[PDB]
Design a protein around this ligand. Structure first.
Ligand SMILES: Nc1ncnc2c1ncn2[C@@H]1O[C@H](COP(=O)(O)OP(=O)(O)O)[C@@H](O)[C@H]1O
Length: 62
């Protein structure tokens, strides 16, 4: 299940334009994948954290 989830996250990140000098950590992948899904389904997303949690970056890439 974990492998399938990370595979879909990598797939969705691949769908987004390739960005150089950007980290493929679980943060960015999960953020972008879940915001794509949530705004697709009209369900709210509430990303939080601290400076460096790939939330605004995920917003811009989406
Ligand atoms: N894996 C990563 N996670 C967070 N920030 C990254 C990552 N890779 C690169 N960055 C840098 O972070 C900057 C914006 O991301 P970030 O500041 O983390 O967003 P947020 O506003 O959510 O903190 C970019 O200029 C980018 O160079």
């Amino acid at each position: 299940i974990l492998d399938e989830v990370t595979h879909v996250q990598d797939l969705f990140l691949r769908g987004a334009p390739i960005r150089t000098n950007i980290a493929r950590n679980l943060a960015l992948k999960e953020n972008v994948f879940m915001m794509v899904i949530c705004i697709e389904l009209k369900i709210p997303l509430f990303l939080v954290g601290k400076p460096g949690s790939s939330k605004s970056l995920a917003k811009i890439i989406v």
